[PDB]
Amino acid sequence: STRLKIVTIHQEPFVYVKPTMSDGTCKEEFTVNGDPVKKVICTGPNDTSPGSPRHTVPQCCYGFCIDLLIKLARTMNFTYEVHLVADGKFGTQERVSNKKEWNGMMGELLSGQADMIVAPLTINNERAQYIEFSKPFKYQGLTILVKKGTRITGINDPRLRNPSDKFIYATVKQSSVDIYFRRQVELSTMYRHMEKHNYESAAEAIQAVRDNKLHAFIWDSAVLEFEASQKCDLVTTGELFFRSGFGIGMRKDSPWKQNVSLSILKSHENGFMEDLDKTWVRYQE
């Protein structure tokens, strides 16, 4: 038929993004088990600043989600080409005008720029109205990343719930967390604080916590727990205050959607998913 267009996003440890070598190939490296790291060529914008042109260059992609893609493609016998989402975002629906539009990977999937989203993409009601999610390939939730020494009890801490400019917290723009805080009226005090400070990417937010420019970063525990395990000047605090899962994203009329979900279930059941967790997620402490 046709190769599937896969869209993904930079998000360690699920998707690492590195330059190609001079010859346009990806350097051969080996996991902490000694096995070769599987890499794919992924095209994506050379300039990631806001309001800038998005002309693309080939890059190298690897990680939990790329291992999962490779397994899915082998199981269901499709070929593919991977690219990084042009606007750098996961995807929310915003008012334009009385129209609404999806940005991020969501907008690319709905417009046909992608045929499948393979990424740490949170399953939620807002997105499921428009696309098909697989059964979750990862169960996780939200937690809070702070600089080591910062003491906040969790999501009910008064420095979050009664905020001021003395303690700044934030999440990633146009993400599922943005949606979560915008949706629940009981969180509106926090949402209004965060809208002044939200970051364009998780990596920029995490760096800002390290630089003491952001006092708390509210984000996916699968990512934040990994960050804390590698950067010992960072810690999570408060434990999961919400639970959510990541799923493969497809258009509602995709022919692949039944077997994608069955393969995810099979991989949880036979230990393949746990092997990916051992390889990419938990192995440091």
């Binding site: 939620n124 009601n125 499921a128 629940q184």
Partner: peptide
Amino acid sequence: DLALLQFVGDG
């Protein structure tokens, strides 16, 4: 599905 996802998202 949408109802269960709404219940989760609304706490």
